[PDB]
């Protein structure tokens, strides 16, 4: 068992309290960018995912701790026939309210076969699980399906969060995502917040919550305290 | 289902209208505003009341655009009235639980006031006790924004939910509205008069105006006045009616 979760805080804007964490997988000390693609191609991602989901639910129970936890799903995990049985079973196993668990799938993953995403996410949403669309702005979305999917939040891609000059293309895109949130009834999370000016500007643009190194780096449950 | 199809097209068919009910200083003092109340003029069923279709609207999400239309028309009407010289009237608009939690609520209020050049102090937003107290920390963030814009905040159907006195003081509410259920039962239950008195006393000690709602009889009016209610609303003082008929 060399697999460990690190947790990164999500924080209500403007400076408001921490409302939850994202679980981030780690393995020397190996980062997931170095091995998740091999796991995806080989199918080992599905067992690793079962372990991640279980450990996140276990940790949340242990804490419960007035907050929720977000787990990432790769394209294979999202499409895997077992996914929805397994989410329901993991919440049942730990007697954990479904409102405490968030599942993140990327824009690309969700939009690849939107009708199939809809069958899967509708089940998940009827069970009460929070559904987040990650890396938003980096894929291709149908506005029609963006409304139809029972998502509760979009997470702005880290790639748009750099110098964020007021007249930048990046700022326009952040504004557009915020406006999608406002018109489609979705919370918007900015990810990759490293500086005070980003925090301030993203808050004024109307992001609902923030994640990034400035607010807290990923760390193991113990160090998080 | 017929109701579902019919409600979907109700805005397209201009079948939705606002009626307005006077709120009056107690006992019968000047009218200080109105509550906007949605009605549906149905070509087959006639004038349908919102208890008969707002739950379907909530469940389907049709309540969002129905609410945009309600807010727009209410703001239009208040503007018109202000320009007609009714300087001391406000208008109160109801918010369901879904509208109160909608990510765009505050932007939509700001846009509607700007569209009709309406000072924010002439708009009152009513959220029920239950709605406000379900997640009080979240209610606080929402209501503080609305209150900083200058919009009045009313806690509706008061007495029907469960309130934290702590958050009841922290919320930037301006008024509590006693639920009509407590007014109607006064002649038929000894507990109701105590409950109504307690609500009035909460207003007095937390610095909130109290509105008594559902006033139908002279004796209710007299009793509520003697208790010290600030304002009254009810059939005795004036039923909901269209803006024109109200005059
Ligand atoms: N430069 C910078 N980076 C920041 C900042 N704040 C957070 N990050 C990093 O950005 C990534 C956020 O996760 P992601 O976009 O979902 O993207 C994740 C996610 O797609 C994938 N991944 C991580 N854990 C899991 C997992 O348990 N399951 C699955 N299926 N995928 C995972 O690996 C990707 C990269 O993971 P990480 O290395 O942990 O990198 C994490 C996080 O450490 C910041 O302020 N500045
Ligand atoms: N028996 C009796 N009833 C009286 C008397 N005085 C006032 N009422 C009624 O009490 C209700 C007061 O509104 P509410 O408690 O906010 O309760 C409202 C409110 O929750 C909701 N509603 C109405 N319009 C709207 C709207 O535009 N948006 C939203 N979200 N909800 C609305 O529907 C509920 C019922 O609306 P209405 O049928 O118009 O019923 C109205 C009004 O007609 C009286 O003396 N006797
Ligand atoms: Mg993620
Ligand atoms: Mg991301
Ligand atoms: Mg009301
Ligand atoms: Mg009421």
Numbering used by the authors:
A (entry chain B): 448 to 474, 480 to 516, 521 to 681
B (entry chain A): 435 to 681
Task: Quote the paper.
MucR is a bifunctional transmembranous enzyme containing DGC and PDE activity that regulates alginate biosynthesis and biofilm dispersal. Both cytoplasmic DGC and PDE domains are required to regulate the levels of c-di-GMP controlling alginate synthesis. We determined the PDE domain structures of MucREAL and PA3825EAL in complex with c-di-GMP/Mg2+.
